[PDB]
Amino acid sequence: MIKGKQGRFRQNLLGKRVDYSGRSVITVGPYLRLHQCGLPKKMALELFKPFIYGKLELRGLATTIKAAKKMVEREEAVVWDILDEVIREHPVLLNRAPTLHRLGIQAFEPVLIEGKAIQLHPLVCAAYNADFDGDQMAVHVPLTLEAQLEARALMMSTNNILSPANGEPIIVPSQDVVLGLYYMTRDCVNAKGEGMVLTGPKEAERLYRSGLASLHARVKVRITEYEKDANGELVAKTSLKDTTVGRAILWMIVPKGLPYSIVNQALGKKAISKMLNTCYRILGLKPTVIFADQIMYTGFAYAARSGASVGIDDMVIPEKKHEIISEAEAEVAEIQEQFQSGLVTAGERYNKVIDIWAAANDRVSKAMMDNLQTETVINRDGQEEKQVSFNSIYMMADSGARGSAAQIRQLAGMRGLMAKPDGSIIETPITANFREGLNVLQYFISTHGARKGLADTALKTANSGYLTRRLVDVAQDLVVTEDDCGTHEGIMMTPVIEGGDVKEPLRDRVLGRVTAEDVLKPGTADILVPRNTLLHEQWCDLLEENSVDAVKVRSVVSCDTDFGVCAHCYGRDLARGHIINKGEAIGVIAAQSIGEPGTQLTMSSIQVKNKG
């Protein structure tokens, strides 16, 4: 009875078929806010059934319970109203299948749709990692009032903009919203509405909707920015600024605090996340949720109105491709002939061959990236001039919507030298992009790398699973149980130098984490910040301005606590920003953060380069 699977020690760990559960296939949910989960009718009248009974018998529509049951099973119109009332605010928990992250059990409010598919806000499709190609999520509910308050406070989808592991947001515009934003703000040298001064953003939207001025139109407007220059005060300044009509239109969605220049570039996937993060740090949380909703909506709408579509003719191939490949073929011909004469050994010949193939591949990649990018020569109302192109493939790649330069290179340039199944690089590469056809030999070669990649991913799945399990097995012990251990032995953090390639400055690896000793400016006897102080962003900026190369930071690796870890000695929670409150387990935060990003993991003389 105390042994084996039926052993009553390891019984609540194997797995419990919890009630009030659910399932469904998933469907995109634009028109939802960022804290709403479209739940089906046919599944929301079989989850909140007892709640419906309660609010029904209490209202007296059917006092006796069996009458209430027979009413709900009768689909009477009143039960829809009662169900709407009960689900008015009754958070549900949507859980994806492999729950590596701690975001994988986020909880939303319900809004009822018809049909049968658990809708799901697009932006929150990243933490889940779902892809809307058959992914299925389970709906649990919290019954007891404490559990309701937890699902609304600790887990609601609008209180987890920042993922546990990495501080920066994980509600980041992803696939079409960024393409829409990118299109909505791009500098076109000459188009309708060029050369004029309209008004603030309102007349810009009026101009665009009427069709008078094209969306891309370098034009001056009068945006006014409320910058927080004064101490916690919206200081407003307005002035005629150059922009694009589309940029002025998008500026209406930015909240008050941000400066205008936050949106004057051609917003990619990078600048958009930077804008969202800046909105977080400057104006707190709730404006960031409002602004994420607004950016998603005003991205989808203008992506649609753009109609960016991938015609085949927009995967332009260089005209120099065949010439470069002929030159490479001549090169390998001469090298092979020389090897046959014995002047160069077999290994050297092979290495030279692959090197010249790499060189030719680089040439072709540069040529195609130059044809795709730029290459759009158009009149500016005077003579001609070139601007960054609008080809849908290049527009995607520059925007970073989905597909970086490598893949479009594979679409138009030579698709490289595929390594043989062992791993040795094939001497004769694939000399045909995808737009032109492959050959049976070339395609049969590509299958090698393809299948090896698939199998290695399938194995690394379970590999990362085992690693997470070990980590959470040895980390679950901890829990932040001490406000302050009052130590002095914190490690001294410095920028990390990868053999002359310092990548992480002191910014990140000391961000938030609490200093042990008072930060001393390099100027003598000049204490920069006191001892036990939190290193939030402004103090980090002070560190940058003073450029401190080493600061002593408290570390959980040695905190004077009996069975936990000091709150101060841990730092910021890196899921909410403020110092970790007493209790929030960090072991099963850590284990999972050092877990989930595992499957992504792949399975003579010094020349001084800087002044010093």
Add this chain to the structure above:
Amino acid sequence: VYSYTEKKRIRKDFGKRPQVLDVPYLLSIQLDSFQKFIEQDPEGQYGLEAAFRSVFPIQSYSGNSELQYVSYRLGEPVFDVQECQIRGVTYSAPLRVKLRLVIYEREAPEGTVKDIKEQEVYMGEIPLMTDNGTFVINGTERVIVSQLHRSPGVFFDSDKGKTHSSGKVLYNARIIPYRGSWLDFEFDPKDNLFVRIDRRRKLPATIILRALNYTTEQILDLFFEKVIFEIRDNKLQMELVPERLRGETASFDIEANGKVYVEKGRRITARHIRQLEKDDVKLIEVPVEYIAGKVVAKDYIDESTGELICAANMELSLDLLAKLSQSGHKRIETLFTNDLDHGPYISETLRVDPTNDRLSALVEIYRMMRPGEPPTREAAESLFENLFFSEDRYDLSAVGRMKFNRSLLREEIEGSGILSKDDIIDVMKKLIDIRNGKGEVDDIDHLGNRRIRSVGEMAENQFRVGLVRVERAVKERLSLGDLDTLMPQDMINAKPISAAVKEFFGSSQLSQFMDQNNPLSEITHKRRISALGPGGLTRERAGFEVRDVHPTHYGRVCPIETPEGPNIGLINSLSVYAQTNEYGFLETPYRKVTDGVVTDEIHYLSAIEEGNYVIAQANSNLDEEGHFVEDLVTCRSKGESSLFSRDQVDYMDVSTQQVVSVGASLIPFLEHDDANRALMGANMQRQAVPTLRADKPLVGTGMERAVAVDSGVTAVAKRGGVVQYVDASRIVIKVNEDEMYPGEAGIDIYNLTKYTRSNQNTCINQMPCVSLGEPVERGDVLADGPSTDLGELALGQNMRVAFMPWNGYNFEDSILVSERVVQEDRFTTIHIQELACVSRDTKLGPEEITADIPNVGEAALSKLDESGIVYIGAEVTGGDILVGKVTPKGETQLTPEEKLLRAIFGEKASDVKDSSLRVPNGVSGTVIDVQVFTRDGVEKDKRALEIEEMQLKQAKKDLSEELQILEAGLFSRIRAVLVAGGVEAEKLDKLPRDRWLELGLTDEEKQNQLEQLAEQYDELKHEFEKKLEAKRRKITQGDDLAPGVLKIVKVYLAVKRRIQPGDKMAGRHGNKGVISKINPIEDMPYDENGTPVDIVLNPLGVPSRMNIGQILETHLGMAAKGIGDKINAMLKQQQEVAKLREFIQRAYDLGADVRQKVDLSTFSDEEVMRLAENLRKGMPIATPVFDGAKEAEIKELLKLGDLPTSGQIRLYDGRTGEQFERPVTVGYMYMLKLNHLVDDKMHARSTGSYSLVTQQPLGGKAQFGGQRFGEMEVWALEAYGAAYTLQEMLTVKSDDVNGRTKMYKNIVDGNHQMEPGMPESFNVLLKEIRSLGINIELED
């Protein structure tokens, strides 16, 4: 030329390379194997003949009684296929074996047998295989997927020792036999050869050789050559071999022949060796100290007293040299020692050899195989012989022998299936050679060494197992055999063989339930090559050298097609042209190339034979003579690829698609596609549900036709002629006169298959695709199957798509769909379920199927019948009773007063609990059929008798109508004969059909033919009567069921799902998607002249996950529908042939370089009009996979229609009415509807049925189950502070009955509150521990 069915719709084809070997008959690997299994083989080399003659003859030990096998025969099956589907039994047939038993007298072994006997005794029943290569074993088609495994033979595998942190290579030889016990050898890290028979406790490799009766001197001579020596004065002279001096240095001054060849310290350079050979330098003086390092070769014994001076395998010490010198041993022959080329590792093995006695090695083996047993000479010898030498317990099959002989470079191709001394000796020889830098190693993932085992071989294997078992029983009985008092029926027993074979074809990992939800799924699941199964690589033990793709898969196994996920690359498919070599190695066809002339004659090459020559890739051009236009033509070689000269080519491929499989060659523009997405596309196509009305794909590959024809579900004709009578359930074909039999032709009666359930709930409906009176040629398509359209396979449907990101609803990969696609209802399947209700007889009386049920309203009983079974065509819904079933109120309960009641019998009119089988919650349906099955000895009730009478009357009708139609054909033939001779019209038509032979006819063969036809008529009457009686008997007799069941009634629900916002459509290039919304017709974006668009996919799925094939498919589809619209416009104006014929000819030409070359001039303009009618909604375009259709051709084809060359059109936005800037693509991507249907996925749960012992909510979609709250979700909650929700996921919603009830009370009462307190599980555990003497108390 084109047959009628072909001429119905000519598929425009863009192919360039002229086919020389058309696509073979798919499923050949299955039918050929099975016909090999059952067919009576006179030579008996393979099949049941081989197994019988292997197990036979039989005789008990000194029994003077020999049992011999005469012949075998496979009688007719008791049932036929269709009633086998209906009933549920195997589609098996008896297996009658003619055996003969003969017995002699005493002291007369060679004397004449005193008594004999012979009989055709029943020998088990064997499953058969239908015409589609499937087995109907339990009312369902099970397919025996052929397996792939390491072939029998020897494989000197390096086995790279990545362990030991040393890089040393532990060369391994493995003599794998087809049947027996293995035998492998390997070098240990200490350079000592070791053996582990069947992977038990390792032994020194020498042991078997000294267990083989080889003396140590013999062992040394076999493994090692020797060096001769002679005592000749001081510094004894030894035979110098300059060749042996290779790879050696002069340890002493080599000053022979009066010349200083090599001074001490210098190597023996090739100059010095050549000088030695030139002068014939031979045995010369050498130092004794130099010889001291040698090893004695033989066992030198002092001849003076015959005392062993030293056995061999010992180093030479100068004292031993002097001792043998005094004894007169002039010869000091030593084993030739070296390491660079002749490393004597087996000498070290002999040193490690614990013993030398033959019996000692036998004892070693005896303990090795069976540890701890009492050692014994006789048993040890028997073990040693039977492990390898005895045929019964060891057999390298002929494939094994061939591979073994070829691996050892033997001149011979055929030999005995057992090993021998020289076999293992040569294996050891080559093993040490390889370790000595002589010979590479084999890689098991090279298809020469892999082998393909079909159904027939597996059946023969299991049947041989059964045969040896029954033979053992036969010997058992014969040893106790009585004198001629029993014939070969007591000695025999059919049960073991039948049980074994039905266990195999049934419960085995290679008898999977056939994947029938599409013709392509069926044919792919047949042609499958699995690496799993018995004697194979389990899906976790296999590593990565087999999940990879070897460079000989080309032409033998499709790289693209394979399931992904857990077992990727273990389940390879088969190429379209691949076959199986006579031994069973995957061959492939190649075009013979004599000089520049690529001769169209075709040669089939195995795996190894491919490397010996140089092959040209399929799409290498020619110049109308077979000469390669490009002289330095690209070609492939022994795993290589280079530009070989025009004459350095010995073979060329047959076609541009022999690298792929049908499961992935249906993909169009497969060349312009990444391998990952083509793989996922092939997997998707394999599982596409067959929609309501089949729609010919608008962009095919020319392989859909053959796949559909040869798949099996297309009701292909048998003889040409005319279609006498079409119908929704039957086609009768009047045979063309030439093809008629010698008598009684004019009858096909193709019984189409009206609606019936498939193996995944998809209607298998066959419709007739021939107009009445239309002629039909042999082998054409009379009736479209599920997902077929005039023969062409049609998996999904067209759908005018426009790649553009609409307002979000296609965000990640989602897919809009206009209401039109669901309004006109072009995606709508006909899933047909099968609910089975049974009536067992448990304790306390039988189960009753009466309509009488307690605690049920009149509404439930309204639609039932009196018996308790719903009427056919009853539009049931959720909760309605399909079958009224009840049980007799539990069991013996209450108290002994209850036993008193049972003695008096209870007093309950009901006295029965309700156990009726209702519709599962959430499914509608219209009942099609309700079959009833009865255990023998159970009288059929009202519903049963109703169905019985119905089926009997229908069968009477069927036999009557087939007899009538055949009689009509016979009398039509009689009338045709009577046209010439006896042509009296008035006399003929006056009298009735009673007598049409009494008419006048002179002495001619015509009246003899009429007499033959009359005999046929009377035979038809009698045969009809006998068939009628047999069918009546089969219908009436009750069918045996599982034990304890009186009767079972099975009802087939039929439902009509509809495309809805959770399904999963998907294109063919792996571009999945879940339908995200069903918009109104307006909100969709419409092109310039009004027509909306029926899908709006997401463009950003193209650039990454590179599958730009689908864009080319969209464009070419747009051009196809463009030509279709042009033809439709011409027809609507009722244009006159010339316009049509011209336009169609022009469209079909399009032939800068093509192979169609069709001509509509000689096309019988009526048939041109029919062609226009069949093309008026699209001009189907083919595009063979790698000989595709170039872009410029697509531009021209679009230009033939008025559509723009770009392939993009301006789309207006429906909701606003403005223009989308940035013009957008619009074409016809042939989209599927995979059967991941939302309403089979979604599954709610509040307080449904709970579990048995776990007492948790019952899990499983089939029983209203809630999603599993596994561990990782528990961690997910722990990371959050959320604790009460976890504590309630564990206790108040898993097992706490009191907590469950209390929480329900609070929720209904309007209070949201758990009850604080330790879960009772803690209390149960606490009492469990307290059961043991453990305090286990609590604390504060």
Add this chain to the structure above:
DNA sequence: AAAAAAAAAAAAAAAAAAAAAAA
């Protein structure tokens, strides 16, 4: 002899022997 119920479908413990160190 037939029918019904139970269960099957590499890690580490111990010890022999080789080598180090102390008398």
Add this chain to the structure above:
DNA sequence: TTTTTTTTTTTTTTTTTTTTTTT
């Protein structure tokens, strides 16, 4: 030079069909 102690490396032990039991 011999004995004893310690190390380490080798070996061996730990949902369906069929079998055994019962009537």
